[PDB]
Amino acid sequence: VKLAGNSSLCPVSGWAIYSKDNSVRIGSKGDVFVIREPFISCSPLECRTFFLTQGALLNDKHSNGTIKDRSPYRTLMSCPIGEVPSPYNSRFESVAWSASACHDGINWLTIGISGPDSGAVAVLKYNGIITDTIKSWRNNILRTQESECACVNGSCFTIMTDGPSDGQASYKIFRIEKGKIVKSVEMNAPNYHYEECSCYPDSSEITCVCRDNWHGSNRPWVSFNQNLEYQIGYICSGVFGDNPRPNDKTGSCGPVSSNGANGVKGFSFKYGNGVWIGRTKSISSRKGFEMIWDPNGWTGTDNKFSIKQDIVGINEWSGYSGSFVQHPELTGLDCIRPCFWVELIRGRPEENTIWTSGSSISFCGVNSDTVGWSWPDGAELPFTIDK
Amino acid sequence: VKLAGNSSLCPVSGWAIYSKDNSVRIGSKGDVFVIREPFISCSPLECRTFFLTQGALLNDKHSNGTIKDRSPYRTLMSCPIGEVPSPYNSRFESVAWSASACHDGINWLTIGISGPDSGAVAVLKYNGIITDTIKSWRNNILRTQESECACVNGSCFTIMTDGPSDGQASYKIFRIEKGKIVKSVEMNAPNYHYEECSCYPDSSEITCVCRDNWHGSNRPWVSFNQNLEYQIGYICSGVFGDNPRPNDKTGSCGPVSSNGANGVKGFSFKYGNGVWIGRTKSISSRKGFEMIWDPNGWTGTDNKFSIKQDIVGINEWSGYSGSFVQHPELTGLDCIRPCFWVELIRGRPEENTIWTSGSSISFCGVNSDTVGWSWPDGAELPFTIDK
Amino acid sequence: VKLAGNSSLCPVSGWAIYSKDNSVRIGSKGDVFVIREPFISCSPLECRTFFLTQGALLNDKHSNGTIKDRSPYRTLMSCPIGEVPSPYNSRFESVAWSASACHDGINWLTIGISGPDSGAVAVLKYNGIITDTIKSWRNNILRTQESECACVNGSCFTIMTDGPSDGQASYKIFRIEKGKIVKSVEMNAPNYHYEECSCYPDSSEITCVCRDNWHGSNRPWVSFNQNLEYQIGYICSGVFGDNPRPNDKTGSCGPVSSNGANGVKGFSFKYGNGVWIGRTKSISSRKGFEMIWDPNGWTGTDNKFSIKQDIVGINEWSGYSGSFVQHPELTGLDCIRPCFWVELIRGRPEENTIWTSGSSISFCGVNSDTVGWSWPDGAELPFTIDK
Amino acid sequence: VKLAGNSSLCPVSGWAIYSKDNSVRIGSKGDVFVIREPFISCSPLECRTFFLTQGALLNDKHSNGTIKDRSPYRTLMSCPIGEVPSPYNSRFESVAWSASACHDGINWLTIGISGPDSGAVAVLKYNGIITDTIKSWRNNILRTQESECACVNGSCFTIMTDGPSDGQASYKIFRIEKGKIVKSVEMNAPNYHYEECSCYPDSSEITCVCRDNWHGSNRPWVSFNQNLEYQIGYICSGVFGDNPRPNDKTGSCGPVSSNGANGVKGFSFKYGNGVWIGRTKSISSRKGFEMIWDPNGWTGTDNKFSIKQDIVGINEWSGYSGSFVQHPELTGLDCIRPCFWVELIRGRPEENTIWTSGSSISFCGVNSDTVGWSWPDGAELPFTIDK
Amino acid sequence: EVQLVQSGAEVKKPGSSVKVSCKASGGPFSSYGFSWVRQAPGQGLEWMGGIIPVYGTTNYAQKFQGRVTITADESTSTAYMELSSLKSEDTAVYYCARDLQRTPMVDRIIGSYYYYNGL
Ligand SMILES: *[C@@H]1O[C@H](CO)[C@@H](O[C@@H]2O[C@H](CO)[C@@H](O[C@@H]3O[C@H](CO)[C@@H](O)[C@H](O)[C@@H]3O)[C@H](O)[C@H]2NC(C)=O)[C@H](O)[C@H]1NC(C)=O
Ligand SMILES: *[C@@H]1O[C@H](CO)[C@@H](O[C@@H]2O[C@H](CO)[C@@H](O[C@@H]3O[C@H](CO)[C@@H](O)[C@H](O)[C@@H]3O)[C@H](O)[C@H]2NC(C)=O)[C@H](O)[C@H]1NC(C)=O
Ligand SMILES: [Ca+2]
Ligand SMILES: [Ca+2]
Ligand SMILES: [Ca+2]
Ligand SMILES: [Ca+2]
Ligand SMILES: [Ca+2]
Ligand SMILES: [Ca+2]
Ligand SMILES: [Ca+2]
Ligand SMILES: [Ca+2]
């Protein structure tokens, strides 16, 4: 039955580890897809790990030059959580170099973006059947969340961006129902920049935490209801969430231009005026990951926080991070619980290999005892194909 | 419940990409069948990719000399769409070096042709149980569509050809019910040649678009109803659909002899007097693929067309193409939607390898925004086994 | 619901090919079990391929010396028909170096024999739950059909042999119900020798065709009803069915001593006074396979037969063969249809390798057009592990 | 429906072999997890093999130094019995270097322990959803059964240990209901030491047989009811069950200090004052395995026993062993039948390799004829990665 | 034709052991039964044991059970006979002799299996 989604976020006091696939380590021997931009999304019965393959396997010559994010060979596929993304256990979803997926409660909705940079087309599938398409309106690379979309009452929502990555672009909110786009609104957000949003439903509405790749070291956000009336803003906290960023300092409810140039996909969970912030430990590279609870970070500009939980050691590689929720329909609770995943990027550009891939770890929020630690990728690079 | 099939073809204005398996690329490392002649067919619940294996894996010595289309080792197998044809995810259907398969709505029907060239026997299976056999009646290699058959009201239809590939042969229509051949008619089509037909149901009837390997650069077609009363003819369009062919010129409603010698398996969708034509981009070799909408091409002989959508670049390898439909029982629509797949042949005879195999892409027709692009195989040849 | 089994054998006039797994060919690259003694058995829903693994994979050093039929590492496992016996698609049944399995209509019954040569114990499982055991009663290797057992009315029957392989041994018939041995009878058959029987139900009774390894070049048989009252005898036909054997000559209803020493597992289908005989083409080695219809071969001693259908060419390796039936519960027919499988042994002792394994082909009887051909293993030996 | 668990243990007179996966042997070629601490647990429908991976595959460089029991890469995963623990057939359960799992009758309960040594946290999952957590209360490595937990009437119980492995530690009993910890009691057991308990339900209560790593060569035990009222003690039999141990001598109902230093995970089944003891054959190393029936061993201190059944030869490697039961809901019997598994450790420290892994064998108790034999690992070490 | 080359002469004190090699300088070796026959001076032929290398099976005469061991080397096509606890009555000429026909195919291999058509 449909996912109601009228519950508020469960309030959380930590993070318990949920899954770790150990892909790249197992990829040194097994047959493992070269992947990047993975994300988790759950149905009222199970959770799956979606990812963008490169049409090639690790330790294979076809994994050469797989830095390039866009090729006609990339495909969106999914496998059970904690499992390695192998051709023998992965289900095909769509041909895409930019993707998003969520479950309205009755069927998997997948959004796959492929085509040329000037004419990219997003293919929408509901139960694997093509239900709708949408073509780039700015003719500059069309891209989407790279994380799960948010479904409420039977309608699922997502964010897409068309235009420059280093300047003012065009951003849209969509309201899909059974794979058919029923409403869309372009956001009137001058001087804002939205990319790779992490959207989660919260008490019949949706709030997306996104990445400002143009002039922002804090994260922009947009919240909206089913009618797509929206409000925009930036996380005011002096605990900056993007990477790169400056050191913790006085924040701003607008874009912070210092180290405001290109960033990393991330997420945040808003609790009133507070915010759970997931970010890298390093300020320059994509190293380490941690969760920080700022009780006034959503509306306040100071750098004070009360809780910090280690996720990945500051010396070890991290990458994209995104939110995913577990609805009461799945958990039996009375509130929609938040969780998140972390991508562990290995190889190029930072390492001496011919390839780039990533593994994943995931955590779910609980109101009980937790602990901080380091759950890194763990692969020993370079691989045999790199010699 | 049975597949009614009384709906007309949905009218289409483009093609959205449906799947891409990236077989040969993943075959460089993983365990992947050496395949050829793949095709997609759908049940009211799922879609599958059927293919004729060679009893061997890519990058293995047993893939040597696998040009020969007929051997006692070739078997018809199937795996989910967009998935790599591996022995770890492929279901066995039948021993065959020529096959066809379709779903009447309650069970998979598979047709496998094996045996000697003078005594080939087609084994018919309904739910994997052998239900009927038919033996070669002209003792010259017996062959069939190599694409999905067409089911209406509970009865499935196919075309088989017995006789010479470079001359006049014998062609028969069959009407199968639960795997049992209930009626057959030999077509009286002198000077016609039918091979590897692409049959789709259209409002309680079936129209097959076929390949004239003897003297034809346009495609022959045959349409029939449940009683197997049949019409024959050739696509009149000056936009020639076979490969090789001549340049676009004045066409003919009969076989066009110029470059009329051996061709390639193809398809077409007739809409009144118009036709959607899928064909290679090159005139001599099997390179590139494109979809062309000729609004009067089914009955008119001019070379004018109004719409062309790129599928595979003119420089990259293409191969067999075939139609497959998605019935309202599966999609929930009110008309049977058309789709098609493209085989991407790699290796011999055009490339310096010891093997020949193929990957697949597929597209489904939508009445919405689409884009043309190039989705090629992408494998870097030769492989390590070829040194 | 239970498998009634009161239908007579369907009368047949040929054999249509059912499956071919191409194991050893795919085993050169993929991860494939080193197997031997495979057999097919069907439920009222599906058919499966059982086999005895060697706890090792092809082209691996652990496949060394795998001639020896008995080791603590051999296990009975099963996979879908026509599929390769890989650890990624094989279901575990029991630890065994001699096995038998059949489906009473509600649950798989498996019989696994392991232990020392003087104390071998057959483990009986019903739905994977150990339901009974039986210990060797003559302390000389305890062995069983290596093919499917026969179920009637809810009771399944098998044959086991305890004692010498080159002399008089002890033979017992069992009547298992839901995995529990409820009745057993030792056969009073002096000068007879029974090994590796191929039993099939025939209209509420069972007739086993077996292998005389001691002094028999014709095949011994035993038929019995639910109360295990039995009749014994040898196939009288002058078309000898064992391997080795003499040339076709005057047969005998008793054991034929000429070339009566050790033989090969085989099968036969009795139709009144006629018999369908499956046997190798060669008289000395295990080469080729063919089906021969002798209309009076069950009770007559002449060498005349009326129908012969080629299965495997006389020059190519063959091996064990066994019967398996498809009940009306599965096929919807009004009679229990007969089928058979053929093991294609490759490697030692006949070939220059360090290993011994086998692939499988299978055929089902139909009353329609068929053809003879050669469907051999096809693997190019030696493999890379043998250098 | 819930697992009642009010039946007593079925009385047994032997052990019939249930499964053998041949992992390490197949790991030489196939893609197989480097595992350790495997155990079997059954639902009312199936049985599964849980295990702690090392995030690496056999014969891969990432299997180097995999002696260390604790790393951020170890994960609790499961696959069907007798199947090889491959990433292509294994289901993910939780991130853990110490685990326990059982089925209450409606959903799999899994307990995964990860984190630092001073702050380890056990993540509890019910149907793969995180339902509870419990943190280390003594800040010295938190560990659990490494075998199946025991469920009665819908409540599942387990044992956890916190503190020194070479001295007095803290031991707690838990009562989990639908993955939620509802009651816990710390055991008042001075001079006792509990580690890696093998718990089985027995007529509405639970009795765990454990490992005394501090000063015990006999096995400690603790039994409790649903209210967690408990009784403690040691197996009094002079047939010592731990490894190392002294020679069979006069036993004690307290801890036997002679060779009382560190031991091996084991099990035992109490029947009145009799006990079925599973132990290694060697007194010093982990070699061989056997089952011993001592009719007065539970309360008596003599070394006399009446039955001994060989499992693994004294010369071949053995390792962890644990109990697992099959409830009447699964077997249809009127009593809860006992079974057990044996881990076969290969590699370090005893062998010249860079890795440590294990395979498994399992036996189930039957009141029928059985036999003793040796079912060892069988892998030929070192592997190619060790050169 | 096939040639069997044996090791040179041997002299032993009582209680010691001796091992004699038998190198099949030809084709047959793998699937052929090899027997070891000794003959005391001026006395009759006495068969000690046999081996089938492809099946890895041996058969020993009851007189020599416990102190005779026959092994094979499939690589170098060589057979071996080792007799321990040597007594003065073991002084004899020790022959190794291949069989005349290829061994039959045995699916159920007895650990003591052996065949004999003629050496
Ligand atoms: C794959 O199959 C082809 C056959 O289609 C194999 O080709 C054969 O290659 C061998 C050499 O590798 C050729 O043998 C040569 O014969 C000449 C005498 O004509 C001799 O002087 C050379 O020393 C050599 O022995 C053979 O003629 C050729 N056959 C054909 C029909 O082309 C190929 O070897 C196979 N490769 C693999 C990897 O399996
Ligand atoms: C597969 O198993 C067979 C046994 O059935 C192995 O054969 C053995 O091979 C070795 C050499 O690889 C032989 O050893 C040799 O011994 C002689 C002395 O007799 C010595 O002079 C040589 O230098 C060498 O060490 C051994 O006798 C032989 N055993 C038998 C019973 O034939 C084979 O090596 C195994 N192969 C693999 C890849 O595992
Ligand atoms: Ca930025
Ligand atoms: Ca603050
Ligand atoms: Ca042509
Ligand atoms: Ca036109
Ligand atoms: Ca015989
Ligand atoms: Ca006759
Ligand atoms: Ca101890
Ligand atoms: Ca005692």
Numbering used by the authors:
A (entry chain D), B (entry chain B), C (entry chain A), D (entry chain C): 83 to 469
E (entry chain H): 1 to 119
What did the article's authors report about this structure?
NA is an important glycoprotein on the influenza virus surface, which is known as the target of licensed small-molecule inhibitors (oseltamivir, zanamivir, peramivir, and laninamivir). Here, we investigate a monoclonal antibody, Z2B3, isolated from an H7N9-infected patient, that exhibited cross-reactivity to both N9 (group 2) and a broad range of seasonal and avian N1 (group 1) proteins but lost activity to the N1 with the substitution K432E. The NA-Z2B3 complex structures indicated that Z2B3 binds within the conserved active site of the neuraminidase (NA) protein. The NA active site contains 8 catalytic residues (R118, D151, R152, R224, E276, R292, R371, and Y406 in N2 numbering) that are conserved in all subtypes of NA and another 11 framework residues (E119, R156, W178, S179, D/N198, I222, E227, H274, E277, N294, and E425) which support the catalytic residues.
A gel filtration survival assay indicated that Z2B3 Fab can bind to both 18N1 and AH-N9 neuraminidases but could not bind to N1 from A/Serbia/NS-601/2014 H1N1 virus containing the K432E substitution (Serbia N1). The loss of activity of Z2B3 on seasonal N1 from viruses isolated after 2013 was localized to an antigenic drift mutation, K432E, at a site previously conserved in seasonal H1N1 viruses. We hypothesized that the negatively charged E432 in the newly evolved Serbia N1 may hamper the antibody binding because of the electrostatic repulsion. Z2B3 with D102R may enable the binding of N1 with negatively charged E432. To test this hypothesis, we modified the antibody Z2B3 with D102R in the heavy chain and then purified the mutant antibody (Z2B3-D102R) in the baculoviral expression system. A gel filtration assay indicated that it could bind to Serbia N1, and the binding affinity measured by SPR was 401 nM, which was increased 100-fold compared with the wild-type Z2B3. The complex structure of Serbia N1 and Z2B3-D102R further demonstrated that a salt bridge was formed between the E432 of Serbia N1 and R102 of Z2B3-D102R as expected. Z2B3-D102R dramatically restored inhibition activity to Serbia N1, with an IC50 of 116 nM. In the prophylactic groups, mice treated with 5 mg/kg or 10 mg/kg of Z2B3-D102R showed 100% protection, while mice treated with the same dose of Z2B3 displayed no protection. In the therapeutic groups, mice treated with 10 mg/kg or 20 mg/kg of Z2B3-D102R showed 80% and 100% survival, respectively, while neither counterpart doses of Z2B3 provided any protection. These results indicate that D102R substitution could restore the protection by Z2B3 against A/Serbia/NS-601/2014 virus, which was in agreement with the restored inhibition of NA enzymatic activity and viral replication in vitro.
